[PDB]
Amino acid sequence: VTGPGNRPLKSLSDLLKGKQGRFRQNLLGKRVDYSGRSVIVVGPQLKL
Amino acid sequence: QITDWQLASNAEHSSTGLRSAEVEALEALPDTEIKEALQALPEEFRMAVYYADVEGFPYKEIAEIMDTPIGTVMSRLHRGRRQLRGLLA
Amino acid sequence: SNNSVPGAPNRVSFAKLREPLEVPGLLDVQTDSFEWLIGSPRWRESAAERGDVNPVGGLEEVLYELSPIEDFSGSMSLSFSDPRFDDVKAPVDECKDKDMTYAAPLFVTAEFINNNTGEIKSQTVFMGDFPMMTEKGTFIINGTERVVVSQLVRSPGVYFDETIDKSTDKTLHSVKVIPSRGAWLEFDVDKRDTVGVRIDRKRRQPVTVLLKALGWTSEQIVERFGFSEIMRSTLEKDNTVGTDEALLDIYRKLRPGEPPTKESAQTLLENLFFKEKRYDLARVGRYKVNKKLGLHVGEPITSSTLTEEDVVATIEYLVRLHEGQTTMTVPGGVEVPVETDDIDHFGNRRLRTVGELIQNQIRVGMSRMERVVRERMTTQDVEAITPQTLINIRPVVAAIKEFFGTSQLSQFMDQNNPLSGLTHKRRLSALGPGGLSRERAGLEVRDVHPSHYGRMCPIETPEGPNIGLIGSLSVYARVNPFGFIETPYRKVVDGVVSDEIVYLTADEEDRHVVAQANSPIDADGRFVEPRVLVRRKAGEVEYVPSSEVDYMDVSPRQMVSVATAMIPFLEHDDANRALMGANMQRQAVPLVRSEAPLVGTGMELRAAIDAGDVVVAEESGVIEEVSADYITVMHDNGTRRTYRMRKFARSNHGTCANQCPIVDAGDRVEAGQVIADGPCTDDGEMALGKNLLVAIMPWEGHNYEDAIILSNRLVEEDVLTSIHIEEHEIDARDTKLGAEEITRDIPNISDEVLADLDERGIVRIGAEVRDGDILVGKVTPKGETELTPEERLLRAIFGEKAREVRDTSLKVPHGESGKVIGIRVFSREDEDELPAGVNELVRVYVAQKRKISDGDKLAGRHGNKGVIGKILPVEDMPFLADGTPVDIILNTHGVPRRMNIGQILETHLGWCAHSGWKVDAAKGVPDWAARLPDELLEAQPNAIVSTPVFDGAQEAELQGLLSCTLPNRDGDVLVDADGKAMLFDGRSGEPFPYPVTVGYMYIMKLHHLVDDKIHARSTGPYSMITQQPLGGKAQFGGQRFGEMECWAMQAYGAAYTLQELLTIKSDDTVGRVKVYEAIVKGENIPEPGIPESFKVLLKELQSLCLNVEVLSSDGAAIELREGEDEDLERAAANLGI
Amino acid sequence: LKRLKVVAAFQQSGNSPMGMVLDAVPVIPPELRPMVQLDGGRFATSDLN
DNA sequence: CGGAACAGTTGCGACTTAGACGTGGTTGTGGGAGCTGCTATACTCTCC
RNA sequence: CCCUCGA
Known part of the structure; x- marks a missing residue:
């Protein structure tokens, strides 16, 4: 059964399975507080 | 899937937005000034003004809970309110 | 030296070869297609030039195939003719501002005829506001500028596929009949040795079943097909005989549960294939089938549909194929080779251009309007009908709108600079409706194919998952009227190379022998060598006799795109880094001031003009008036033309489109001359970067591993x-x-922070805004229950009756700053058209000047990239003997193994261009300079030169020029014949012990910039669904700690960190708040609770009718819920009750 | 054997094959299949709705 | 820092309405788009 | 989700 664009709708089984499913995306991994990101540059003056 | 951008964009117009754990934690902290001001009130005025101005009880129900005539509720509401007005500014 | 453009800066070319053919207009792939759709007079003249078939426009063809529209009783008819376009509703920048669609009203002459009374009614009908292609080959839809990418599809025709991959190791042979619009028909010889038939995915049947059902006897098949031992074996395996049983068995396969009928099924099979309404082979498909089966030699153009003789011809071709025959002759057909077809060959692969896509949508919506007209013919009273009562235009306009809105080919235009936008219009895309799915695209579709030569650039294509699925039209390529890409070649007659030019398609190119452009020729047309490397048959490269040569490339760069043709010394770069270079040029941001490269390929001027972000004089004249706002040119007519300047305009990606006039009052200009520079242009040449002084050397570890060091x-x-x-x-x-x-x-906002807001609550123009500042104040109604008990008490005792609200004001996102350069306001109070439920809409434009900084990405044109790792004070930069500090330090270790040595060659030529040179001709012309052009025998400082791709500055020539380098102001030569210099250490003052390679290299600022990247979050918004943090910097989200990241934590065996990440940093709703509460109070972190995503998992499982319970050690389940009193008890305790 | 895996699986108590046919279909809470208003007055729903 | 007496406000509760909005009926023809350009592997079904 | 892009 397809919605707009002939895109097949995502069933209740699709929530669990797949790389984007609950297990892989929302359970074995998560987005977290107290985190950041940026581009990295070389630190040659740094201690290990 | 509903995009995170769609959720935030929807929350910009919401009655209550998307609250961080920080906001929830700070709001849950006691408000000291208000607490100490309420402490200075007599206990009767404190209960009555509490019921009315926080819980929203009618004078009938407030009188039923406090075991006084409704007139007492009116006097204590007015006087405790003016007391808090002078106390907090 | 690009002498065909007036006023073009003189750029001396190292090219030894003469290019007989000029580069065609680079937008002709867009404009030519759309001019055919409109039936423009330009297209008419070019049609008359190519010869006239009685040419019909795209719209005209749709109208003629549609006409006549007849009543099912033949009582009345409606016909359309002579479409016309009115003036444009609004200018381009008007639609961009007002969120409009650039469009023109379409009018058609609709003539209704009554077949009884003979009365005729001829009317003019308004068909809609027709979205128009701009001068730049784009469309503006709802204010946003868009590009329609040409689509790579398979042309209609017949294609045979021989698969040896069967487990039996034996070869099988397949065939597909593909129309333009209609039903699919497949024939397959079985691994079990049976000839199958599949109709629109329907299951196989013996090929004789359908042939019989077409009226064929079981004997007549044996007459034509009897030579096949496999067809003999198939007729006995055929279960039933006779036309009635065959037609009945066919109607059963199509409709699963219905009754068959003879006249229904034969009229069904007639209308399924042989009728024009439900099955259409295009003229392309007809000719391809004709040429593939050799059926019609006399070139009848009459009708395009399949024929019974086409079915017989297809089976016969397939029959002889699996047998192994190399040739076939058909009744009334001649000498066609029996062979498989290459699906990826460009003679079998077609390009659907913008005009054809739009035409297809016009045909859909027009057919819908036809359906409405028919339904309206039965209802209305004749003589009470005029055409305009029959014609409802809504589905046509809606059909056009749905295309530009929902189509993968209609795309948000990529304008980072004029080059990203120019190639975008030249893109050839294989993905889309009628194309192939990304899931179904194998590695064989993404490969360079020998038919691509001179047609699709082998270099430019994405390096991500879209590699091989998106390509660029070659510089000299055209799209022929049938959708096939052609490239010009030079006629080679009797071993002489003539100046006659012929445009050949991929099919025509296989019959001939084509010499590469690098093949040497002398003044005479004779080849220098008796053996020459050529492409001859199906893309094999061979040393070949010059005696037999048909055609030759018209120039180098003929096989290359526009962006690739701009890479100097491209021939010295490996194809991978050359790919990186083509894609990286389109990521360069327009600088506040541009600078042309000292070292070009000569393509930069013609790329900037054709891209259209530069202003060009349409007519020669004198400049009457000039300012930053506009330029007016007075023609010799006495008529004048004014050009308004785009001033600090935002592109789709946030770069700055800014035009500046390059002409002065009184100057005399010519038609085609550049009046004003665009964002990335300087004097009309594409300038994507700056010329920086570069030294190649490790410097104190700051340029370690692709990191770049910059001068402050x-x-x-x-x-x-x-x-x-x-x-x-x-x-x-x-x-x-x-x-x-x-x-x-x-509410509760200081007057100090509101100081830059105007009286409406909108920030004032020219204000300096930092993250958190209010751009637009806004309040939203808040319910009573959402007040805090403390907030409720104060509002009551203070007698505040004002509406309870929340502050929804629009604020600057984190890590952003700038000046407010613009405001737009749209109110429902006025007539401004807004979406349902929206009272007022405010846009605020902020402009920021971005200085280069650590973490920005720079690149050269050779694929050499890196972040800036350090910017140093100018004093400790290494400097030359005359005191000049170098601009940029690139690490030595990163050059050689990347196999892009052009970056070195360019650097050598960049220095010679910077300092100028004079070769010593006193004794004569040196041998190394003997082939140089006389205009390159000396150069003034800062000379701009062009080293075209595949005809460049040679190694020896670059080496000789390094000797004659002019001195500096003191007469000192700073760079030796090796291209190296002695440098001083800026920090210690000591000279570096060995000469370092130094020169000038062209460096771009790429659109990956730290300011858009750096992001950090303590806490923030969470998804209402999964109760995890949001994601993306725009939403102030958190970083994803994924599966592989958790493996690392488990591999370290750090349990508390992994549990902390997946509970109180993300999911656990009470824990995340109690944790923040503990840090502020300086207490220990609380023990984590249950992640919300687990409770969510249980609920999704229950919704699958799985009964899941978490059991205690008792064996009894556990309700997952929270006591609601704890929060109310704390809130009541906070008030002292 | 393959059949006995299934039948023997259903042989244990507390587990009946009747559950393989539903007279009632459960409905997941709305927060897990939400509906959000969009810029332009339109709405977006999970496919589940 | 009570208990009546007395005089200003929401606020629930009816009812008229004018228009969106869904209902009557419903009678010549008239059967969709889209695709299929993925590879490789295990294993039940199902034709024989 | 899709388009397109970065490592």
């Missing part, structure tokens, strides 16, 4: 600075508790 001069003098313009949008709408209001009255 590039910060101080704004050489890498660029302007970036953001658009912040906000609207007040209707909510559950009331309407939102844009106001300057923001």
Whole structure:
């Protein structure tokens, strides 16, 4: 059964399975507080 | 899937937005000034003004809970309110 | 030296070869297609030039195939003719501002005829506002500028596929009949040795079943097909005989549960294939089938549909195929080779251009209008009908709108600079409707194919998952009227190379022998060598006799795209880095000031003009008036023409489109001359970067591993600075508790922070805004229950009756700053058209000057990239003997193994261009300079030169020029014949012990910039669904700690960190708040609770009718719920009750 | 054997094959299949709705 | 820092309404788009 | 989700 664009709708089984499913995306991994990101540059003056 | 951008964009117009754990934690902290001001009130005025101005009880129900005539509720509401007005500014 | 453009800067070319053919207009792939759709007079003249078939426009063809529209009783008819376009409703920048669609009204002459009374009614009908292609080959839809990418599809025809991959190791042979519009028909010889038939995916049947059902006897098949031992074996395996049983068995396969009928099924099979309404082979398909089966030699153009003789011809071709025959002759057909077809060959692969896509949509919506007209013919009273009562145009306009809105080919235009936008219009895309799915695209579709030569650039294509699925039209390529790409070649007659030019398709190119452009020729047309490397048959490369040569390339760069043709010394770079270079040029940001490269390929001028972001004089004249706002040219006519300048305009990606006039009052200009520079142009040549002084050497580990070291001069003098313009949008709408209001009255907000707001609550033009500052104040109605008990008490005792609201004001996102350069306001109070429920809509434009900084990405044209790792004070940069500090330090270790040595060659030529040169001709012309052009025998300082791709500055020539390098102002030569110099250490003052390679290299500022990247979050918004943090910097989200990241934590065996990440940092709703509460109070972190995503998992499982319970050690289940009193008890305790 | 895996699986108590046919279909809470208003007055729903 | 007496406000509760909005009926023809350009592997079904 | 892009 397809919605707009002939895109097949995502069933209740699709929530669990797949790389984007609950297990892989929302359970074995998560987005977290107290985190950041940026581009990295070389630190040659740094201690290990 | 509903995009995170769609959720935030929807929350910009919401009655209550998307609250961080920080906001929830700070709001849950006691408000000291208000607490100490309420402490200075007599206990009767404190209960009555509490019921009315926080819980929203009618004078009938407030009188039923406090075991006084409704007139007492009116006097204590007015006087405790003016007391808090002078106390907090 | 690009002498065909007036006023073009003189750029001396190292090219030894003469290019007999000029580069065609680079937008002709767009404009030519759309001019055919409209039936423009330009297209008519070019049609008459190519010869006239009685040419019909795209719209004209749709109208003629549609006409006549007849009643099912033949009582009345409606016909369309002579479409015309009215004036444009609004100019381009008007639609961009007002969120409109650039369009023109379409009128057609509709003639209704009554077949009884003979009365005729001829009317003019308004068909809609027709979205128009701009002068730049784009469309503006709802204000946003868009590009329609040409689509790579398979042309209609017959294609045979021989698969040896069967487990039996034996070869099988397949065939597909593909129409333009219609039903699919497949024939397959079985691994079990049976000839199958599949109709629109229907299951196989013996090929004789359908042939019989077409009226064929079981004997007549044995007459034509009897020579096949496999067809003999198939007729016995055929279960039933006779036309009635065959037609009945066919109607059963199509409709699963219905009754068959003879006249229904034969009229069904007639209308399924042989009828024009439900099955259409295009003329392309007809000719391809004709040429593939050799059926019609006399070239009848009459009808395009399959024929019974086409079915017989297809089976016969397939029959002889699996047998192994190399040739076949058909009754009334001649000498066709029996062979498989290459699906990826460009003679079998077609390009659907913008005009054809739009035409297809016009045909859909037009057919819908036809359906409405038919339904209206039965209902209405004749003589009470005029055409305009029959014609409803809504489905046509809607059909056009749905295309530009929902189509993968209709695309948000990529304008980072004019080059990203130019190639975008030249893109050839294999993905889309009628194309192939990304899931179904194998590695064989993404490969360079020998038919691509001179047609699709082998270099330019994405390096991500879209590799091989997107390509660029070659510089000299055209799209022929049938959708096939052609490339010009030079006629080679009797071993002489003539100047006659012929455009050949991929099919025509296989019959001939084509010499590469690098093949040497002398003044005479004779080849220098008896053996020459050529492509001859199916893309094999061979040393070949010059005696037999048919055609020759018209130039080098003929096989290359526009962006690839701009890489100097391309021939010295490996194809991978050359790919990286082509893609990286389109990521360069326009600088506050441009600078042309000293070292070009000569393509930069013609690329900037054709891209159209530069202003060009359409007619020669004199400049009457000039300012930053506009330029007016007085023609010799006495008529004048004014050109308005785009001033600090935001592109789709946030770069700065800014035009500046390059002409002065009184100057005399010519038609085609560049009046004004665009964002990335300097004097009309594409300038994507700056010329930086470069030294190649490791420097104290800061250029370690692709990291780049910059001079702070590039910060101080704004050489890498660029302007970036953001658009912040906000609207007040209707909510559950009331309407939102844009106001300057923001509760509990200091007057100090409101100081830059105007009286409406909108920030004032010219203000300096930092993250957190209010751009637009807005309040939203808040319910009573959402007040805190403390907030409720104060509002009551103080007698505040004002509406309870929340502050929804639009604020600057984190890590952003700039000046407010613009405001747009749209109100429902006025007539401004807004979406349902939206009272007021405000846009605020902020502009930021971005100085180059650590973490920005720079690149050269050779694929050499890196972040800036350090910017140093100009003093400790290494410097030359005359005191000049170098601009940029590139690490030596990163050059050689990347196999892009052009970056070195360029650097050598960049220095010679910078300092100028004079070769010593006193004794005569040196041998190394003997082939140089006389204009390159000397050069003044800062000379701009072009080294075209595949005809460049040779190694020896570059080496000789390094000797004659001019001195500096002191007469000192700073760079030796090896291209190296002695440098001083800026920090210690000591000279570096060995000569370092130094020169001038062209470096671009790429659109990956730290300011858009750096992000950090303590806590923030969470998804209402999964109760995890949001994601993306725009939403102030958190970083994803994924599966592989958790493996690392488990591998370290750190349990508390992994549990902390997956509970109180993300999911656990009470824990995340109790944790923040503990840090502020300086206490220990609480023990984590249950992640919300697990409770969510249980609920999704229950919804699958799985009964899941978490059991205690008792064996009894556990309710997952929270006591609601704890929060109320704390809130009541906070008030002292 | 393959059949006995299934039948023997259903042989244990507390587990009946009747559950393989539903007279009632459960409905997941709305927060897990939400509906959000969009810029332009339109709405977006999970496919589940 | 009570208990009546007395005089200003929401606020629930009816009812008229004018328009969106869904209903009557419903009678010549008239059967969709889209695709299929993925590879490789295990294993039940199902034709024989 | 899709388009397109970065490592």
